[PDB]
Point group: C4
Chain length 252, copies 4
């Protein structure tokens, strides 16, 4: 129907890969070729591709890091994930008390962590990091029901990569009272963080060791606190993206 | 003879790779390009390609996992294997008595196993797993010629992958008598199994430790039974397939 | 000058890669595309490519095992090597006396070996294996100048691959006398060998331990003999080939 | 606008990759295809690509060693680096006294080194290697302010690769006096070096152990000298190149 023509122009750019079946390339009569690399496994297909319940039909996989080409001028669809936001961790275990003793010390004392891989596309770009946080003190470890516990949850994050030792403490709120830990009373820790490209390690911790906890139930650093990081997540569009596909496009 | 035209449409799908020289793509005037990846080494050629006695002539190899392209509109042939069905194992050694003690325990006690790699294309799809099973008790280990031995062969299969410990026992028949083990009297163990994508480990075992075997010849768990898995195989079309080739096709 | 046309036909074949700058593909108006894989590093260029003194000019390298494409219809040249024949080894050290004790024993006793990687293209195809062999006994280790030494050089070759133990002894001549070892008197060991595809390990050895050598100079198995494998080589066209390039060609 | 045509000619060559955003390929109506491999990560884009402060915009990355293709006839730009010259090392630590004891001995005694990877394109081609060198003796380790120290800085360079032991000593000047080490008085070590392709290891050293240094402050071999290699670099166009991109071009 349409004769092949030479491509004069190259255009290179990044596509944000998001959730569900979405268009990777639009119908574009000018386009002759696209060379594409996805940082995650990616399913590629035509208008028939669907992904009901995370099962792709009418697609085929290309691997993370695999360079491939599409030479059509028509619409092309992708699927990578059904995750609407980015959930880093969900914890049921109470978080530990921790002073800023550095990465090695926290790992040595079994403080759970997770890593954020900051893509070049997010290098030095501020983003929202949140947690759903549950404080419960009433009767916990036998603590009095009316004992006032001060809490201040934090993320301790490496300023360099996961091989460096120094941590930056990030906080957004403090709270004091007798915590009943009812699910509807959960707090939101919400900080902006700005990170260099690469992997950064994050330790969700309780920073406040309350005098009353020390006296009544012999709590000490690295012990389980009255604070639990129910969910650590981001709904920031910069983080909910599953990765950026690299595109070199050629057009007439 | 035919001018080159632009491709509007992409279509992504899987081809079941079967035995002998078969067509990979048909002659199709609309087709401009195919990007293909085979999970097994694959020999690709034109109408001249043959594979008499497993020696491919008029073909060339592409490696397992290698993405390659064909830009013709003509017929294209493949060869991967001359195996008509899938034979997992053939055993001459008597199978061991085993209780469901989990994967680690069976491996520790040298119960032979084999793995089934369930492709995404077979994720949660039921399939036939069979064995040709020979019971022979007459005079074996000095057992009486008229001693009645009860048998119940099984596959113990990991429900998770080969790194998980719990096993599911699959059976289809039990048999009792004095077994002469004549080749024409061999039984067929035939079960439907439904597995998640990934590797599952399978232990062919004898599940029944007959009282008479214990008393007469001091048989015990993990000892060699009167049961031999002559052949473990499947003639189910879902398993006889050597793999699924991934295809992205572009057409005018 | 010439409009692009669709390719109907695929043709897959192997090209023998030989020495110096040679044509990889001829000018062929029908050819639209070639997908090529070389088992050795290969330099590819146009009519200007030369390789005076093993330095390629007007070429660029593609790596061993790298699939690449050429989409021209013109002539294309390659270079891989300036070696006219295949030289496996040159030895200055006297070869050891060895009985056929198997691969492990010969390696344990420091009998030098070399490996032949038999390509699929040579699977079960007989080929010439030769050695330039020098026997020198006169005054060696203090042996009498007129002592008669019997010699019978051999290649001991694994019948399976380099991981298997059994060796096959190959011979073509025996010789007896007082050997002066003059370069112009060197012998040629020349055997036909037929090997399965894959790696085979070869031990050049002296098989004859002469009674007189035992008595006079206390020679024993695994000691240095009066035999030296000056050069082990093949000028058989099946072995002088540096490898076979895999070609899938598409034509109108 | 322009109908596709067949390519008759192949041309293979190397492009010197230099600093900032530069053209990789010019607009050339004859060009139909280029297959390219860069030995370093390379950012590729159209006329819009910029790299202000080392941040590429309007580009996408191709990895070191990754073969990729461009099928346009238009201009194509690259970026690899903002480094105008090649700086190998900058040292603040005083260099050690070293005799030519070979590679192993220098490494054993903690003499800092750096490696030069000589590309095939520079095999046996002479190039300038320089250092900004600071001698300071006045009061150093308590040395007299008018003690005359003789200096002769050198590069000791492996003649084979980094796995070989012998070193070649390269020098260009000697100097004698009482060194105040003022930044504006720094010397330039400037030698031509000719190296085979591959990695060569370089030890910047002080070769002269002055009698007065031995007597006054007990200096000995492998001790810190009065010489510091402030910067080791090359502004030779053969070395300032970040690498050579391999190009196979096809044209009508
Ligand atoms: Ca309190
Ligand atoms: Ca019984
Ligand atoms: Ca004799
Ligand atoms: Ca002096
Ligand atoms: Cl969208
Ligand atoms: Cl068929
Ligand atoms: Cl030729
Ligand atoms: Cl320039």
């Amino acid at each position: 129907q349409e004769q092949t023509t030479k491509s004069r122009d190259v255009n290179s750019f990044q596509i944000p890969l998001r959730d569900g079946v979405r268009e990777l390339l639009p119908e574009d009569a000018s386009r002759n070729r696209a060379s594409i690399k996805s940082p995650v496994d990616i399913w590629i297909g035509g208008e028939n591709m669907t992904a009901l319940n995370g099962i792709v039909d009418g697609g085929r996989k290309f691997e993370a890091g695999q360079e491939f080409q599409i030479n059509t001028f028509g619409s092309v669809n992708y699927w990578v994930s059904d995750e609407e936001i980015r959930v880093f961790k969900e914890y049921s275990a109470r978080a530990k008390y921790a002073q800023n003793e550095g990465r090695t010390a926290l790992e040595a004392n079994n403080v759970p962590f997770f890593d954020i891989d900051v893509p070049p596309e997010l290098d030095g770009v501020p983003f929202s990091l949140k947690a759903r946080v549950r404080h419960k003190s009433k009767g916990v470890d036998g603590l009095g029901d009316y004992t006032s516990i001060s809490v201040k949850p934090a993320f301790y994050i490496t300023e360099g990569d996961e091989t460096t030792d120094t941590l930056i403490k990030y906080t957004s709120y403090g709270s004091t009272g007798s915590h009943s830990g009812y699910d509807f009373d959960d707090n939101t820790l919400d900080v902006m963080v700005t990170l260099s490209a690469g992997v950064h390690r994050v330790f969700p911790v309780e920073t406040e060791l309350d005098y009353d906890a020390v006296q009544e139930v012999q709590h000490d650093w690295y012990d389980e606190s009255f604070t639990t990081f129910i969910e650590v997540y981001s709904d920031d569009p910069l983080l909910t993206v599953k990765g950026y596909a690299q595109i070199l496009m050629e057009r007439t």
